[PDB]
Every structure is written in structure tokens, then in C-alpha cells.
């Protein structure tokens, strides 16, 4: 709601407060020194005031070279207040199908969840790599037979265009 409590105005959701206001206190403020509590002017009831649920919208997508299908992430907003709905740590992720199978991270979601296009968009808990139990014992050594030579390419920035703004 949009409220006006004896001149105090703002937008938010009104809930019952558990604050122990003293008989003379009419409203409260947070550490930020903004209003966060009000005593109702007609019934001497104490209300807590918080703003209405909000959050960023991120679009999870493969490139337009491949598909025009997208998924939308409402960051840190519960699935219920949002209006293939998948709840995760970052929030409610709608349009991506959740599958247990883990894969390499393609599009990161956050908190261990990554997304990829596999065709459709899927969401999953990321794999950290293949498992490899080492055959350890107190008396066993492995030694390479045929060996290989590998060439790795490393690319580093060195300079940037030298602009001059009079």
C-alpha cells in the first residue's frame, strides 16, 4: 500500500510489530535514520513498515545465434510474489527446467546453480569435475610410459588505446 500516517508518507507493506515502544514514541527509525515503524494516530497500535517486495530481473539466455528462448531470474524474490518454476538461493528461476544431472557451468545462476542450453534451457547444480579416486597405498608408484608434449596458448593484454581529451 501507499500510506500517509499523520504526514508520514511512503510505499510499503504494513505488519504487526513486536517493538516495545514507550508511551511517548510515535514512530521509529532504522540505523539508516529512515522511518521504519509508526504508531497509528487513531488506535494506539504499533505497526512495522517495510517496502513492498522487489528485486532485479536477470535474463538467462543462449545467444541469438542459437535460440530466442530465454529464462528470467528474479533475484532474491520468493516464487509466490513473482506474478517451470525453480526455487534456488539466488531466487525464483522461471523458464529453466531443473535437472539433477550436473554439467560444466555455462550460464552461472549463483549459489552453485548454472544454466545451459541443451534442445532447451536447463538449470542444474554444477559439477566440480570428474571424480578420480587415487589408488594410494604405502608401496605403490605410477610412472609414465609414452609421454606427450603439449603447447598451451596464454593471451595477455599489454596496452590500451592512448586517448587524449583536451
Amino acid at each position: 500500500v501507499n500510506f500517509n500516517f499523520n504526514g508520514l508518507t511512503g510505499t510499503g507493506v504494513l505488519t504487526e510489530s513486536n517493538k516495545k515502544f514507550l508511551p511517548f514514541q510515535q514512530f521509529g527509525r532504522d540505523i539508516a535514520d529512515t522511518t521504519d515503524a509508526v504508531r497509528d494516530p487513531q488506535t494506539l497500535e504499533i505497526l512495522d513498515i517495510t517496502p513492498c517486495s522487489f528485486g532485479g530481473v536477470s535474463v538467462i539466455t543462449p545467444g541469438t545465434n542459437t535460440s530466442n528462448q530465454v529464462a528470467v531470474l528474479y533475484q532474491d524474490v520468493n516464487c509466490t510474489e513473482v506474478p517451470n518454476v525453480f526455487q534456488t538461493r539466488a531466487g525464483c528461476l522461471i523458464g529453466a527446467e531443473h535437472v539433477n544431472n550436473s554439467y560444466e557451468c555455462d550460464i552461472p545462476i549463483g549459489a552453485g546453480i548454472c544454466a545451459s542450453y541443451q534442445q532447451s534451457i536447463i538449470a542444474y547444480t554444477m559439477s566440480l569435475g570428474a571424480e578420480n579416486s587415487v589408488a594410494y597405498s604405502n608401496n605403490s608408484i605410477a610412472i609414465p610410459t609414452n609421454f606427450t608434449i603439449s603447447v598451451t596458448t596464454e593471451i595477455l593484454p599489454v596496452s590500451m588505446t592512448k586517448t587524449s581529451v583536451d
Partner: protein, 320 residues
């Protein structure tokens, strides 16, 4: 920023639009910072492509790694020291002005899995897991390679293997006790947490400043004044809040740059101290490098560096 500077106000947002993209290059810079932090994390921890595991029978030389290797009974498969480190070391009010906090991509359980894989690899394979397929090698023989690396013959190790294992065990116990006792030991991470808490608390507290306006409350300004006067008072508030936000972002970019340098040092130490054996003096601890162990910590990494240090003195005469 559209919430930090003109929160829940369409008229204010329309006035802010007269300043173009200052609001979008600051948010772009902060998005870049978040991406940069995730990049720093995987450069530090995602240096092994396989998650290595130790055998069920932890017979690793009489050297007790139970302290740094994960304990299954505790939920989070952290080491005892790692659990100790994590135990040792407004968001609504902030969010309400549009300054939210994004979760890290890698949770503590995956960071624990990376540190577990790196430590298990070091223990069961020496440095071979970091340069190709992991070879298995007995831990005592691995110790023999590290002794040869520091210029000490293998026989010193084999003749004194029991004392070396006992001295190692007490050094590990000493690390556990030192971290458990001294609260200031993790000051390097606590100062970063405090600097970010202060930066956010200062930025948020700047919203209580008038900046020359008759009132700091945007709803009160719009509730009291009509457009011909409200535009000047709001413009004054826009100037003050935008300057404070620009200062905040600049402070985050410089602090992030220092964190980036620290991340490069941590990644270099991970590769050179953990995935190998370094001959660089005082790079990986004070002494002659034998091996190092990574440990997970809140927003950071802790290295346990095992070094060889000469003790008792005895004089001899020499000749060329």
C-alpha cells in the same frame, strides 16, 4: 541507483533521466566488480579439473592430516581447523534503497570440495596431479622428494622418519591452538569485511544528509512542495546523492583493484606452493619450502606452509 537516488518516485526518476548515463556506467562498473570477484574465486580455487579423494584407510606415514583433511561426521566436509576458521570468522534497510547483495557463485561446500581435492591430491600425488595425470606415490617417498628439493639427502628423512612425523604432528597441533587462541590471527580477512561494512554503512548513512535541501526525505519533499520549487530541491538532493554514490563506486573500484592484486598473489601461491615445490625464499612461508596445504576461509584462503628450519648450532673449522 534509480532506487538509491530517486527511491519509489516517478517524478524524481524523470528528473534523474536528465543526467543521462551516469547512473548506468556506475551500475556497469559494479556489475563488473561482481564478475571480477567470481573470476578471482575460480582463479584461486578452480585449478584442479578433477575432485581427488583419499582412501578409506588413511595410512599416510604416521603423519596426522585428520586436522586439515575433511571430517565426514561433521555435515560440511571441512577440516577441524577449517571449521574453527569459519566459526571464528540493515540488509532490508539497504535493499529498500536498491543496494542489494548477490550470492557468490561458489558456496562454502564447493569451496570445501576444491580445498579437499587439492589437499587430497597433494597428499596422495605430490606435485604430479598439477602437471598432468596424477601419479600415486607413498607420502614418505613424497617427503623424500621434497627433502632432495631442499638440498637434504633422503637418508636424513628415512633415518629420522619418526621424529619428523612427531614434529609435524605437534606443529599441526600448534597451528590449531594458535588459531583457536589468537582472535587477531585472521585480521587480514576481518579488516576487509569491516572496510566493506563501513563503506556500505557510510553510503547508506549519506541518505540522511540534507545536501542543502530543506529535508533529507524524498517523500517529505514531494509531499510539501509543488514542481516549481520541488524541482530545485530535488536537483539539490540528486547532486548530493549522485556524488556520494560516485564516491562509493570509486572506493569499491580501488579496493577491488587491491583485492585483485591479493587474488593474484593467492593464486600464484596456490599454484607454486600447493601444486608444486618452490625454491623461492620467503615466498611460501619462512624457511625452506617442503609443501603447503590450502584451507577454506570466509571470502579468502588460508595456507599452511610446511618449512624446514635449522635449530641447534655447532662450530667447525673449514678449508677450501
Amino acid at each position: 541507483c534509480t532506487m538509491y537516488i530517486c527511491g519509489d518516485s516517478t517524478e524524481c526518476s524523470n528528473l534523474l533521466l536528465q543526467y543521462g548515463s551516469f547512473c548506468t556506467q556506475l551500475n556497469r562498473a559494479l556489475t563488473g566488480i561482481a564478475v571480477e570477484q567470481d573470476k578471482n574465486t575460480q582463479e584461486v580455487f578452480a585449478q584442479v579439473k578433477q575432485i581427488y579423494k583419499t582412501p578409506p584407510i588413511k595410512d599416510f606415514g604416521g603423519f596426522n592430516f585428520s586436522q586439515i583433511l575433511p571430517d565426514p561426521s561433521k555435515p560440511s566436509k571441512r577440516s577441524p581447523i577449517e571449521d574453527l576458521l569459519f566459526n571464528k570468522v540493515l540488509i532490508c534497510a539497504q535493499k529498500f534503497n536498491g543496494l542489494t547483495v548477490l550470492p557468490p557463485l561458489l558456496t562454502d561446500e564447493m569451496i570445501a570440495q576444491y580445498t579437499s581435492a587439492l589437499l587430497a591430491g597433494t597428499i596422495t600425488s605430490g606435485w604430479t596431479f598439477g602437471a598432468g595425470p596424477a601419479l600415486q606415490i607413498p607420502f614418505p617417498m613424497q617427503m623424500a622428494y621434497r627433502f632432495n628439493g631442499i638440498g637434504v639427502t633422503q637418508n636424513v628423512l628415512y633415518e629420522n622418519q619418526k621424529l619428523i612425523a612427531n614434529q609435524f604432528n605437534s606443529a599441526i597441533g600448534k597451528i590449531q591452538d594458535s588459531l583457536s587462541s589468537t582472535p587477531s590471527a585472521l585480521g587480514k580477512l576481518q579488516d576487509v569485511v569491516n572496510q566493506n561494512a563501513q563503506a556500505l554503512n557510510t553510503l547508506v548513512k549519506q541518505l540522511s544528509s540534507n545536501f542543502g535541501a530543506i529535508s533529507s526525505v524524498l517523500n517529505d519533499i514531494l509531499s510539501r512542495l509543488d514542481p516549481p520549487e520541488a524541482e530545485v530541491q530535488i536537483d539539490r538532493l540528486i547532486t548530493g546523492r549522485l556524488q556520494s554514490l560516485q564516491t562509493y563506486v570509486t572506493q569499491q573500484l580501488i579496493r577491488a583493484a587491491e583485492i585483485r592484486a591479493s587474488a593474484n598473489l593467492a593464486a600464484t601461491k596456490m599454484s607454486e606452493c600447493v601444486l608444486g615445490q618452490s625454491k623461492r625464499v620467503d615466498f611460501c612461508g619462512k624457511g625452506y619450502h617442503l609443501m603447503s596445504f590450502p584451507q577454506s576461509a570466509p571470502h579468502g584462503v588460508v595456507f599452511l606452509h610446511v618449512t624446514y628450519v635449522p635449530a641447534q648450532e655447532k662450530n667447525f673449522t673449514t678449508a677450501p
